[PDB]
């Protein structure tokens, strides 16, 4: 037992970041296969940011100004492409560690783990969520941008995310691995409102599933809901609006517990009309929402 | 910007990784150079676990009995002896991916990565510490034992704690790497009482300065207090004293946001006799203690 916010091995991803240099910018890349995906703005100054014409700004670049480097020895840079608000620097040598991956595109609600890098080099692993404004509560500092978001399904590591940038508010944007970035966010310096952020319900009640498999059964009441009276509580409380197949992806959880959906849903609703009166829930003194279903089932079955 | 419950990449540590099986209990093992390191009770049934005589039951144990398996590859045991509360099994080959590695016995206030794993697999990373009564509230199910805890400072990986047991509390506990207990707990299937769950006040104030250098700001007050004054405060709040070194401790916290470590200690004070009022610190409703003033530092700086 115990519930932790726990991240994905990082090990898989460690082998495939690079640290790729153009011009005075050092940010990091993901090398798989022959190739290094990277944010753009790479070839960018900080004025550049201001104004970026990305495809101008790429014309005075060539192979040799890709300074791609895989721990302490440099990589050939043998062709360069931009796709979308990322650059895909074509190596000469394939990752020998390259894992099985794949490139996906997540929807918010999702948790993902990010490896945080430094110079090509890993700092950290913490676990986070594609947030419903399409933003990532991440911590990242200047030069982790490049710095990928990952799932693993047993070997193969589905790359989900890239990190591009701070927005003012102190919340993270970036790409998919195809370079199109989450919600509306352009990699311009220029203010860019994040959005309102909900909280992810669905997760919340998986979360909630966790701390009665756990033991934290404080908040467990008589009483029931129907999805439309859960919906209007939901809404007055920012929180993402419950569908029927959110009910159905909590179904395992609600066999396991023995606690129906709406049941739970009816707990969930006191809990926001009412508070947590100085309580905890699985040590946590607000209702967390970066625990998907998937995630729960996952850490109490002890999948590897 | 940000501030993420950060663990260390744990590739190095996934390399060490293996599955030890002695009769028919399986559980996990670090294979540091050519030794093998585990919880002794893999020798046990879950009945033995109510009443061992380890030494005697060890006897009967021959290093065929030993089951190593790396990967899918099996390893030859070739030695066994007990130290303490872990095996050390002598295999014939060493580990090639070993890093470079201490064994530490940690000091409770003390954060470290947990690499949960099930059959010698790693399932997942997260940070946690070493509480002031010597458990750790981590997430470990049936299997776990062998996972361990650890630091890494850029290529030395410090062993600081192996997972031996759940409390009836459903608390964790375990040994450092030499196989000694933290805390007075044993590895024997009796009711054992944890301790009082005192908070970490230096990691909570090194926690504040996160958040003060992160922007969240709404905490600071224009009071200063006294170490004996603070210290009558947080005896009423089951909060750890505060010291000198812990003072000296945070002294480049207090130079890089120019509140003295005092002034902090005022916030502290108020934060326990008032309450968050519905507020939150770094999204959290509680006050966070399983940061040391060297993983914030670390953090806010990016140590890779
Ligand atoms: C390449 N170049 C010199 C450069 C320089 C700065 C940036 N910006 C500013 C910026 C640009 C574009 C859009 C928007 Cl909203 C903000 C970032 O936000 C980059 N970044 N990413 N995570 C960070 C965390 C802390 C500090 C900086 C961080 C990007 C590129
Ligand atoms: C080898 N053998 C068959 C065996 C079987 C059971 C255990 N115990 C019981 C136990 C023994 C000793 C002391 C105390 Cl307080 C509790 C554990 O606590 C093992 N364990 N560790 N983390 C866990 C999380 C969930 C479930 C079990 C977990 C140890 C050894």
Aim: aromatic fraction near 10%.
């Amino acid at each position: 037992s115990g519930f932790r916010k726990m991240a994905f091995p990082s090990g898989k991803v460690e082998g495939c970041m690079v640290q790729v240099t153009c011009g005075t910018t050092t940010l990091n890349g993901l090398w798989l296969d022959d190739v290094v995906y990277c944010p753009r703005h790479v070839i960018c100054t900080s004025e550049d940011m201001l104004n970026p014409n990305y495809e101008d700004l790429l014309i005075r670049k060539s192979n040799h100004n890709f300074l791609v480097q895989a721990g302490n020895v440099q990589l050939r840079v043998i062709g360069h492409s931009m796709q979308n608000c990322v650059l895909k620097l074509k190596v000469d040598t394939a990752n020998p560690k390259t894992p099985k991956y794949k490139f996906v595109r997540i929807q918010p609600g999702q948790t993902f783990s990010v490896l945080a890098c430094y110079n090509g080099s890993p700092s950290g692993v913490y676990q986070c969520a594609m947030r419903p404004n399409f933003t990532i509560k991440g911590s990242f500092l200047n030069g982790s941008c490049g710095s990928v978001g990952f799932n693993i399904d047993y070997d193969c590591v589905s790359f989900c995310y890239m990190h591009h940038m701070e927005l003012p508010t102190g919340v993270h944007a970036g790409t998919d691995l195809e370079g199109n970035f989450y919600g509306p966010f352009v990699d311009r310096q220029t203010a860019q409102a994040a959005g309102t952020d909900t909280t992810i319900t669905v997760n919340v009640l998986a979360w909630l599933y966790a701390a009665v498999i756990n033991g934290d059964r404080w908040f467990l009441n008589r009483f029931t809901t129907t999805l439309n009276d859960f919906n209007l509580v939901a809404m007055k409380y920012n929180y993402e609006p419950l569908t029927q197949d959110h009910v159905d992806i909590l179904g395992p959880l609600s066999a396991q517990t023995g606690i129906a959906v709406l049941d739970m849903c009816a707990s969930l609703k006191e809990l926001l009309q009412n508070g947590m009166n100085g309580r905890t829930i699985l040590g946590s003194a607000l209702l967390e929402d970066e625990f998907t279903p998937f995630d729960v089932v996952r850490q109490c079955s002890g999948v590897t």
